[PDB]
Design an enzyme around this catalytic site. Structure first.
Site, short mmCIF file in Angstrom:
data_model
loop_
_atom_site.label_atom_id
_atom_site.label_comp_id
_atom_site.label_asym_id
_atom_site.label_seq_id
_atom_site.Cartn_x
_atom_site.Cartn_y
_atom_site.Cartn_z
N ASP E 63 19.82 39.34 -7.22
CA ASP E 63 19.75 40.42 -8.23
C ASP E 63 20.77 40.07 -9.30
O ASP E 63 21.56 39.13 -9.14
CB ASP E 63 19.93 41.79 -7.57
CG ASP E 63 21.29 42.00 -6.90
OD1 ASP E 63 22.00 40.99 -6.66
OD2 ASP E 63 21.64 43.17 -6.63
N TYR E 65 24.11 40.09 -11.67
CA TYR E 65 25.54 40.47 -11.60
C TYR E 65 25.62 41.95 -11.96
O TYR E 65 24.83 42.40 -12.81
CB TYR E 65 26.37 39.57 -12.53
CG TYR E 65 26.35 38.11 -12.17
CD1 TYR E 65 27.04 37.65 -11.06
CD2 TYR E 65 25.72 37.18 -12.97
CE1 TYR E 65 27.07 36.31 -10.72
CE2 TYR E 65 25.75 35.83 -12.65
CZ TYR E 65 26.43 35.38 -11.52
OH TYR E 65 26.44 34.04 -11.21
N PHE E 76 22.27 33.45 -12.17
CA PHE E 76 23.52 32.64 -12.09
C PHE E 76 24.31 32.71 -13.40
O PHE E 76 25.56 32.65 -13.33
CB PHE E 76 23.24 31.20 -11.64
CG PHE E 76 22.79 31.12 -10.20
CD1 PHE E 76 23.70 31.21 -9.16
CD2 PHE E 76 21.44 31.01 -9.88
CE1 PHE E 76 23.29 31.19 -7.84
CE2 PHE E 76 21.03 30.98 -8.55
CZ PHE E 76 21.95 31.06 -7.53
N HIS E 185 23.62 28.11 0.19
CA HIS E 185 23.95 28.77 -1.09
C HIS E 185 25.30 28.26 -1.61
O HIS E 185 26.20 27.95 -0.82
CB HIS E 185 23.92 30.28 -0.88
CG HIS E 185 23.92 31.07 -2.14
ND1 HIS E 185 25.06 31.30 -2.86
CD2 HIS E 185 22.93 31.66 -2.82
CE1 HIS E 185 24.78 32.02 -3.91
NE2 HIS E 185 23.47 32.25 -3.92
#
Lengths: 225, 53, 51, 53, 223, 56
Positions: E63, E65, E76, E185
């Site tokens: 989702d 920030y 990102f 990740h």
């Protein structure tokens, strides 16, 4: 940490002040008071004994260590100086007192009135580092406060002991003389008070015993300031 | 019971100043006595048994 | 003011209980604490909306 | 594994402002992704498995 | 549907489905009552910057920030002026390791999107300071459709799937002409278990060279 | 404090596939040390609690 005791405690505890354990405690506390904030003020450490002589002691209420925040402790178990909020343990003591006699919750936690009438408000540990409860456990203080309890045990005139919680109750091993009165319950802390402190009527139990001994009863009412 | 706890708590006074305290080797009863001494606002109160398993 | 309450107990047989409550008053947490006879492994009160 | 966690964390930004966050029903991996999003100072990071026993 | 490129026609029928209309009602209420990120006009920026035609690589996120001035509709990426999130810093460290590029002074990745990197979060909105607040509201029906469409594309698509939640989307990538690059990740809590040394950037450019396609210039300039 | 590396108290509880349980308490851990420890855990995490030492 010098023997500044002005009353009959002075001579009675003189031999305790000359022991090695006490000298090492005193050196430890001399360093601790230089380096850190320690409570209460050095001149207040023995106020419980100063306000309440061996002779005049009617009831002992054991605590742990002093309150560890600014302007709280002044050398009495449970009491706080005027001007600061009442700790929850003392508030619960005040609520049990309201329940017994109808006295409103006072606007302060100052209990010198109790001490002046022969309530020895004795912590088992008499100093603490700011914000570190039990920082001065196992430094020698309980050799000293054990001796206070031993002396009251040897007294011919009966002594009433109020022992709130297991740590206070563990001192029964020193109270071998069966003429003395023991009042026991869980601690007035909010985390324990509902398991037997409310309804324990410690105040009227004391005054019932003092009436049966022909002794003047205690006026428990704390005045507003 | 081993009856030895780590006690980690965060308080806030009336000025909004905050205190982070970690105590070790506390009995359950010592934690209860400490809780009863606190007049500041309690943000966190965390008792953890030392040597659970 | 209200608290999240997370606690873990162990009975005499060694059986273990996890409870998580939200929206508890200080007093409700104190009442719950006073009911526990099992061994306390964790007792964690966290104020909701600290900031 | 049940892989559902309560995530409770406290952060502080450069101005000294503080944030108290409680999330529920988070996977382990979602907690790890959230940790990777945080630029503020982490004061507390607490993952608790929901329905341990 | 404010989509100005080939995504507009391709996704038109998705916007008329019941799930999407109820999502749109929910988000209309959410934007009135609470602070939601990103800004409503930024929600679809990943599709706006990177057309169906021009898509070379998909990098899935979770989702947006959930802090002020962070999200702007790309996975990102953060707007210029804010600290680089640790996940993105780890991506920058793997990038330094591959090509020697110094750590940029910003987390703004529009340069990637302009060269055909679709920076697609699976969930495209979030309530301020509540990660995963808009999980299970309909967004993954929409982003699943984006992935399904790229799967149906004839020209091979490269998919970068970081972590198990991104990797779960392999079930939609049934066409075996597509390239799948997988690892743990870049979060600091997982990066040391295989993200460092995974060389996602050169793996992509190796595939783009073998397809005769222009390679990606991964360098992020200072601002 | 300013000029010094932050350090953390770490408390965690894990459970293996047999249902056996582990409680660990560490002090004076760097952020990086806590992250390395987290990455070594293959057992089920019941509790993971990192607390900054000297928050104020």
């Amino acid at each position: 940490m010098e023997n500044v005791l002005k009353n009959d405690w002075g001579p009675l505890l003189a031999t305790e002040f000359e022991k090695e354990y006490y000298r090492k405690l005193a050196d430890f506390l001399k360093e601790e008071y230089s380096t850190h904030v320690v409570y209460p003020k050095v001149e207040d450490i023995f106020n419980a004994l100063q306000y309440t002589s061996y002779e005049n002691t009617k009831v002992v209420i054991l605590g742990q260590d002093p309150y560890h925040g600014p302007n709280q402790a002044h050398g009495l178990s449970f009491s706080v100086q005027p001007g600061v909020k009442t700790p929850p343990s003392l508030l619960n003591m005040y609520k049990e007192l309201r329940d017994e006699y109808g006295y409103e919750i006072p606007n302060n936690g100052y209990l010198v009135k109790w001490a002046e009438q022969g309530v020895l408000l004795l912590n088992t540990v008499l100093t603490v580092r700011q914000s570190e409860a039990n920082s001065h456990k196992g430094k020698g203080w309980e050799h000293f406060t054990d001796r206070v309890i031993e002396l009251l045990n040897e007294r011919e005139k009966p002594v009433i002991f109020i022992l709130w919680g297991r740590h206070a109750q563990a001192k029964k091993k020193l109270i071998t003389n069966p003429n003395h009165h023991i009042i026991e319950s869980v601690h007035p802390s909010p985390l324990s008070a509902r398991r037997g402190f409310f309804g324990s009527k410690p105040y009227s139990k004391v005054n019932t015993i003092l009436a049966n001994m022909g002794e003047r009863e205690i006026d428990w009412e704390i005045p507003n300031l | 019971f081993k009856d030895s706890y780590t006690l980690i708590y965060v308080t806030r006074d009336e000025e909004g100043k905050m205190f982070d305290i970690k105590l070790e080797n506390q009995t359950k009863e010592e934690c209860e006595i400490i809780y009863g001494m606190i007049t500041d606002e309690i943000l966190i109160w965390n008792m953890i048994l030392e040597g659970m398993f």
